[PDB]
Write a protein that binds this ligand. Structure first.
Ligand SMILES: [Mg+2]
Ligand SMILES: [Mg+2]
Lengths: 341, 341
């Protein structure tokens, strides 16, 4: 039984300003969640709210701690489905929903003498994450790309979306100095339908292959996502357009995308599990991503990825871009590789 | 880790012959599955093969005991997702796939010190099953209906499909002497689309309400199921047409039915979990059914239902129709009520 739920503000600084389409961050403000059971067991989760994607604000999350306590204290974690249904009402605070739900499983796994990944199926023992190259000058982008490659990452995520011509130039240059690596391009909704297609064609013509082309158009433009998918040689993914299990069910029905970038910060554990099942029951493929989680937060996704083994690609580099005094995940990080203890 | 698997035939005789559209059974021949772990823990499951629904034959299941053994031994039950994936290759032996997957969770939960239902979410502490009135003369159907009503069952499942006129009469007669009960009518594919619609409209005209109208047409007639759904007042369910998670995705995409009768014997635990997620992500509603399971076999569905709490109706009565020496389920039953220990 849950006897207490604590929310705490935790600030983390980025090695350097992180720039993506329409956004620049030098700080990541998260809300840490701790659940305490009467037995003494403590489960931990982390919420990394996004105003841009989920409409959330950290101050708002912190303001509802008491309501969260009233919602689930007294409930036994072995009846976790009840906790999941209740926390699903927090659809306006998706990142907190995710933290609370994971902390619940974290606590439950401890009581059962096991780990969250095994509770979810323990399908994989290891997964590899890519690392992101934020928007900057072509020169700096190429520089960072080389450094990432030299660090051992064989999947490089390239941000674009604000300048088609320069974006194409950047991808081409990066490709030259990182032969052997796969590439993921993320426009974070910056392109129009035709621009998105032009980008893919231009890069394809140079002999460059893109593993995943993330959310090229605006979030409401489902038809646009489909248009790019059907007129672009690379796998197209929905990120901002895919927050709930209902959004995914809709994207599948419309045959809108080849991929969906699942993020616990958008869907929580409950919807994430539904999306995994939906993808495995259709032609949809998945990749798991992140927002601004610290190591404790990425831990939630690592266990989810390892347990379900449902992803072709993993973009869980958030903690790698933040200055963090001490590692706090229940997993092992070895370069791009991640395993469980 | 699993060090061995054993399959063995188990026969159960019916209190009386069970008659449904195009099939009469006097006995249920099941295949019990036992998995042994290096720790000494033993997991149990039961396969109730259906030749009519799954194309399975008891002899064939027993014949591949060695193959199954080779497939799963050496795998830790904490990595159950791996076992699920491997056993998914037994799509030609669905009932066996179910028995093995459940035996796995049964063994896993024992090691973790909990029960299968809690492992699956522990959503509910109690569920209620209906009881079936097989095909017979109107007079005998009415007699069995009264008896079932007297036993405390408030949801009565009525078999029909071989005689439209007599079927209507049977349902109308049963309704008069069981006021207060809800009814589920199952045609087992016996009607043409128009006959199915006429059956429903006639019952409706007499002021009778049908909770679930199961598989009124042939299994391949998806548009027929949809036709009945759009032209009759009661919720229409797919049973024989819904075996795999892929069948369900198709049924949802085509808006063919209101309900899907999930059966572990058709889907196994893996697909059943996917179907539950697909339903919760759409307008689809679910009921859980059975084939010819004995108490040990029904236990698999009871835990699935209690843990997921995903069903509106429960048709888990096969063990109540079979003569069984000793009860062998890990659950408690009081009339239509079923709870866990
Ligand atoms: Mg993205
Ligand atoms: Mg049926």
């Amino acid at each position: 039984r849950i006897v207490n739920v604590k929310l705490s503000l935790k600030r983390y600084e980025y090695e350097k300003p992180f720039h993506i389409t329409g956004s620049v961050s030098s700080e990541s403000r998260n809300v840490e969640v701790e659940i305490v059971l009467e037995s003494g067991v403590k489960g931990y989760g982390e919420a990394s709210p996004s105003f841009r994607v989920n409409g959330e604000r950290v101050e708002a999350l912190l303001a509802i701690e008491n309501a969260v306590r009233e919602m689930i204290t007294g409930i036994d974690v072995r009846n976790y489905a009840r906790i999941f249904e209740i926390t699903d009402r927090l659809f306006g605070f998706p990142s907190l929903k995710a933290a609370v739900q994971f902390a619940t499983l974290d606590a439950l796994s401890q009581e059962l003498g096991t780990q969250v990944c095994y509770l979810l199926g323990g399908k994989r023992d290891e997964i590899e994450t890519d690392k992101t190259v934020g928007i900057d000058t072509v020169e700096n982008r190429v520089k960072e790309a080389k450094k990432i490659f030299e660090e051992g990452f064989r999947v490089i995520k390239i941000k674009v979306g604000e300048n088609l011509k320069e974006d194409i130039e950047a991808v081409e240059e990066i490709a030259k100095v990182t032969r052997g690596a796969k590439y993921i391009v993320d426009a974070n909704m910056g392109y129009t339908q035709k621009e998105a297609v032009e980008f893919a064609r231009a890069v394809y013509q140079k002999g460059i292959d893109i593993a995943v082309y993330e959310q090229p158009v605006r979030r409401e433009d489902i038809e646009g996502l489909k248009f790019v998918r059907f007129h672009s040689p690379f796998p197209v993914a929905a990120d901002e357009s895919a927050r709930t299990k209902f959004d995914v069910m809709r994207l599948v029905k419309e045959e809108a995308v080849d991929y969906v970038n699942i993020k616990l910060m958008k869907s929580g554990i409950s919807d994430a599990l539904a999306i995994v099942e939906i993808a495995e029951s259709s032609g949809l493929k998945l990749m798991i991503g992140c927002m601004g989680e610290s190591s404790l937060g990425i831990n939630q996704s690592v266990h989810f990825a390892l347990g379900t083994g449902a992803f072709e690609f993993h973009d869980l580099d958030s903690h790698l871009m933040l200055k963090e005094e001490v590692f706090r995940g229940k997993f092992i990080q070895d370069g791009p590789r991640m395993r469980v203890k």
